[PDB]
TrEMBL record:
Mn(2+) 1 binds at residues 185-186. The chain holds residues 479 to 2185 of 2205 of the full protein. ADP 1 binds at residues 50, 52, 55, 76-80. It comes from Chaetomium thermophilum (strain DSM 1495 / CBS 144.50 / IMI 039719). Residues 278-490 form the Helicase C-terminal domain. It is an enzyme of class 3 (hydrolase). This is RNA helicase. It catalyses: ATP + H2O = ADP + phosphate + H(+). Mn(2+) 2 binds at residues 1185, 1189.
Amino acid sequence: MPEGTTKRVFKGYEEIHVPPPKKRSDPTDQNIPVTELPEWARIPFNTTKTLNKIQSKCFPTAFLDDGNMLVCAPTGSGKTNVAMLTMLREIGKNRNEKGEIDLDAFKIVYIAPLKALVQEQVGNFGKRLEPYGIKVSELTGDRQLTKQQISETQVIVTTPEKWDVITRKATDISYTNLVRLIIIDEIHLLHDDRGPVLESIVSRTIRRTEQTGEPVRIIGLSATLPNYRDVASFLRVDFEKGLFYFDGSYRPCPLRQEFIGVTDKKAIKQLKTMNDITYQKVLEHVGQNRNQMLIFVHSRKETAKTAKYIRDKALEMDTINQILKHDAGTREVLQEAASSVNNTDLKDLLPYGFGIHHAGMSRADRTDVEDLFASGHIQVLVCTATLAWGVNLPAHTVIIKGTQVYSPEKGSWVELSPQDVLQMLGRAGRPQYDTYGEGIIITTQGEIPYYLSLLNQQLPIESQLVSKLVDSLNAEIVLGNVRNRDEGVEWLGYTYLFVRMLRSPGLYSVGAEYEDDVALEQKRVDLIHSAAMVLKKSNLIKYDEKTGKMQATELGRIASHYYISHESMDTYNKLIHPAMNDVELFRVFAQSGEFKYIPVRQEEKLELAKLLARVPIPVKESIEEPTAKINVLLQAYISRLKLEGLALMADMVYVTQSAGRILRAIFEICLKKGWASVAKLALNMCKMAEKRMWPTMSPLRQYPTCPAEIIKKAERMDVPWSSYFDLDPPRMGELLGMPKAGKTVCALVSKFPRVEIQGNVQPMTRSMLRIELTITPNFQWDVELHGVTESFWILVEDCDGEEILFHDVFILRKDLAEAEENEHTVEFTVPISEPMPPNYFISVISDRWMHSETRMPVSFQKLILPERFPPHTELLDLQPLPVSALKAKDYAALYPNWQQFNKIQTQTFNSLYNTDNNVLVAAPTGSGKTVCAEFALLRHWAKKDAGRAVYIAPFQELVDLRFQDWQKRLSHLRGGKEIVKLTGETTTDLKLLEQGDLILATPLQWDVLSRQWKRRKNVQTVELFIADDLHMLGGQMGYIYEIVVSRMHFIRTQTELPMRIVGLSVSLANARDIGEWIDAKKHDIYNFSPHVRPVPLELHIQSYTIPHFPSLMLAMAKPTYLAITQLSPDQPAIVFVPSRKQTRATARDLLTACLADDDEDRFLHVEVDQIRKLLDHVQEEALAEALSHGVGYYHEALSQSDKRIVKHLYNNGAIQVLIASRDVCWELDFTAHLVVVMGTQFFEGKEHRYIDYPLSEVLQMFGKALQPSKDGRSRGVLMLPAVKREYYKKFLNEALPVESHLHNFLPDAFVTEISTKMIESGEDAINWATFTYFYRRLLANPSYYGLQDPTHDGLSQYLSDLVETTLKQLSDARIIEMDEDEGTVAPLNAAMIAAYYNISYMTMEMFLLSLSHKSKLRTILEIVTAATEFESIQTRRHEEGILKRIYDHVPVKMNNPVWDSAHFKAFVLVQAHFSRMNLPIDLAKDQEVILQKILSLLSAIVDILSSEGHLNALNAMEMSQMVVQAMWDRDSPLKQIPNFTPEVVKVANKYGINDIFDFMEQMNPEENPNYASLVKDLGLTQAQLAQAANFTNNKYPDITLEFEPAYLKIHIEREDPTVHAPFYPGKKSENWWLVVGEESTLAIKRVTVGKELNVKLEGKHDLKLFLMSDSYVGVDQDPS
């Protein structure tokens, strides 16, 4: 239905002319106001006077509503400004009153079809938005990390394909969630074959937002085309508010359409008539009408032929002088500038007014013609579609010259795309200059109605999803968005295809069988199934035909991540075999289904035979048939051969742009099947195409800045690439013979990615080795060619190079690489067969860089595997022992609801309750080992003596849970039994030792007591000694556990009195050495099988391949939801999670996954009106909302009140799921039926790398799956990286090996041992080293420790070489006495305080950094905070910005402040405390742990600097007072008073108040009449007053002092419950320190003071004595 009225039939053509619509401007008064808006949004609208009419209807909805919007308009009508208003509304949302909200809070995405429209958009939007802090950046680079660092900016624009891939692989999920606004330009591309790529994007985003509730605004910008209301409801827009449609009467410049259909006599004679029509239309428009036109062609060279043809035809007929502008002004600029400046020579024939333009031209030459066409210098301008997109350069008339292009995808010529012709004609008509624009198209007669209908709103937009349905479905299944048949049909409900199958289903072959189904439900089911079945047959998916459940396999993940056809993957898995060579691999490439339409033609048959004879890799698979052609085309691309054929150039371009993804997909396939040879080959083939060089040519070709002169010189030499390295500019040029190239090439090899690797072998067993790979970088960074990161592959091979025993990505970070210490480490585990191979292999290969591999052998000739493991003790099938086997009613009363004993308890009952031998019972967690320790106690308490028993758990959280259960049940037992737990301060828990019969203590708490065992007699008095969770001796702070157990055996071997030791542990691998280390006889060692569980554990293992940590956790939320809803649907489940911050993050993840399933409050089995009492009293508001919907979490930062609430709800069945962190796994008293472990890694700030969960923790976590099902078995799933799978699966199905690490901590272990004088010589070290567990494990597993002679000879030498190494480390630390003449060695005075306050030695050694006499108070502030103990504080990611804002708000700054360092965090948080600065909850939990460890650390450096003649220790005493009261060194002492706001401190000081002293005695209703006035001013309620009055007399010291080799006398007096300061967790009473000393130039005394204490201490001198506290500021008396 064309309005066009003119049809003139000619000899050769059929002209069809259409008048422009010219009257639809005054139906409505649509005139808009001036750019006056909310004044923040006026900046991008600079040149625009007022909004243009098309933006009128858009503004009320674009700027003041959030619905999705579709706007159909002409090309230049100004759609971009409407998209601007939607962006201006988005910054108006993320807006403060001052404005410019956190740039990390929201991000916008703009999808445009071609790469030219996006580059001009980052210019147009970049410069308009540059006033705001926002940065617009294009999404370029095929480096995965370039797409990661570019996405760290605010507004990104990109193509539909790239942004799809970004989400398909989900490596950046943490940032795609920040997206709130997405604008898709030219959305009518849905009709194109790339339409599905948009349908995949809109669907998943709108699908999730309609599920997760998190809204994401979408703005559609289309063309004026029919069924626009279909893509409208597809984009989910309200037709009442956000749908706009505009006739051709809204173009800024009217467009006349001149259609010209050539005679259908198809030949090159039809090209001749096309060329003539263009020549006549040139004489008509530029020669007669005074116009400058631009002719659109579709070949980068047909622009050349067309330009010359028109001027050559104008040379004939003598018509050139009609086109020219004969003035000398334009003749000067056009001739001299253009012909001589540019390098592109074919346009040196431009001085005739003509002009050329295409992609294959110098970017500065394409801006010249661009700028000449603007001033009116070139008249005619032939060009390709490259400038139709993305440059505002209009012309009066435009000519689409020719209409069919060659798509190499279809291997056949096909007509123009709708998106190209509408963008071209948009360039027709200057809006302000021309009255109209003439758009002329020339085509064939048969294809006339196609183009006429296109420009008159008749071409329908259909959905091409069906042609990419199977692939796009695989994409959602890989992402976890479709997990069954229902989630698939619910997904289809959001595509453009579904909304088009509801309109005229006969178009989409929808069978008449689907007549009764509402909303095409059963059709989508029939559709998802038939597509998913294709995914199952090719092995890309796991699909159950009955249950409908579908899960994505590793194969399909490769397909989704690399945009590979389901057809091409089916042929990759079949045809790849581990013995493939380079020939047979190219064959697989040619078999790709993406090329199935590319033919071989007889026209190019002559040139193909030329290429096959030059390509080096033989093509023997075929003769000249399509698969041999695609083959020789790839090699022709690598070889950089010249192709005269234009049809081949189109095909080779297509084969090459696809060859990147294809070859990478083949590489990852080989890598996951584990074929080392083919995998290493495929990756090199990747570099062969992406760097376009055969591996034999010069590696210098990879440097774009290397001149071909050097490359052409290097490639005529024979010097190996090895010899280019480690050279200077003089020798570099020498090796090449080009001295001018020396500095140039030497800098190039200087930046070549090049690393040096090392390895350490530790055998855990005879079947598995632990390898510590140390990678050091040996090159110079350069951001231009390296970017910010460099990626590497780590490979591990047999001695045959056949099998891949380990593979993982290694990524270098710039900041970490170019640091002073740049040694990166990585630990992994590989198996090993007993007939050992000679050597393994390890390589580190650059992901992109060619010829960058550092291969290392791993020799096994010197390795010594551990001793074989003996069978577990038999689980004897015995008569269940009754509770009456104990010979007392009250002993059997401890088990009231018990009739028998457990299979393990009955078997161990003999050795425990009837025998005083040492015994070691080792059984899996939860088997009830705790009662085995009760047997030893009950036997012991039937005795005569007091017999102090000592129980020890590895962590304080375990002795607390232990104390609670034994203090309530075992107090009433044979008279009065005192059950006490130690505290940590020695003076008060050593009397608890004498007051108690059973003493609970952690390994360090008993350490400080048992050190002075000769001095304290109650240490030997002990007769029972229990060591619970003893296997933790190889754990965090596990060596101190090894020491105390080894010392108790030394206590009972020196003192002859008997002393029994019992030990509890999980199922061990080597129970001989732990049992003999405890002196338990053979029959007294019970090491039960790990399968001996009262409730069998059904374990599942899900493996993942996702290198991004935060992406991995969100990817695991849904399988956790599936794990709980399916495995334990009616029973409690506990979810474990690596970080404490990650507990809330994965709590909402599970909850959003719940309402995704239309079931919120899924895990809430109690009416919310019952837990309403509880939500209020929850401290963390995130935990309340979580608990309100039935999911609770638990982490170390949680308050003790919150935890007790979570315990109440979890145990009373209120909530069903408990998301715990991994730090509270011991403290967790909870029990579940299903225990899922999310991930096995956590981040450590010291290592700057993620570290694996210890095997102990996975054992402890799964030990909470104890509630059985009806089949009497508990379940647990273990989600881990696919690399870690065989590691945890081994050491969960087999017993746990335990090895000591005491050998690596002997400096800190000798500090505590030499201070007590227990070890005084090198022989004293060796004799001491024998009582430990590491000594017993040396001859067993020598290679793990460093022993090479497993004889009694080498045993004594590895000990001597170690104790000599350790003693020297304590001597170079200047903490130990002499050596090397007497084997004796004494402790330095500074070593005593190192053990008193128990601070590490590396911290103690570095404390000599404050050696300066009278060092600053600011100096000690950064010396204290730079301690090893503060390096254990965790470091979260998004916290690095907040540390900066607290830093600048603080007086004392540090030199060269390290940003990521935990030493800086402790430096800034310790000052955030002095200033009482509020901090977020997780950063405040860090503040606590810093404060717990600093008081002992400040009291240390006081005594350190007092040991020398320096007097700076005075400031440390002042600073010790600063931490307790949270003040600065020079602050108002009034701030100690409660509720003394800084505004209250000033109004007090305005009243002449200096200190609290002259303040309290001043303010009374007796002596100051201002007491009634000062109460109105301070604003303090009567209650807060009483708080201050009780503070001054009982919490602020009153009475003063008087004083009467040197020797002095001191008299003290008082007027002292405890020190009360509400800004510190754990307090101590005030200590007062006495030091003599004069200012301009000693003895120090420390003692607690009570009522009336008398103490004594010590040319001509008149000295001066000080008396300062450690808890209160202000009282410091100093007489001279």
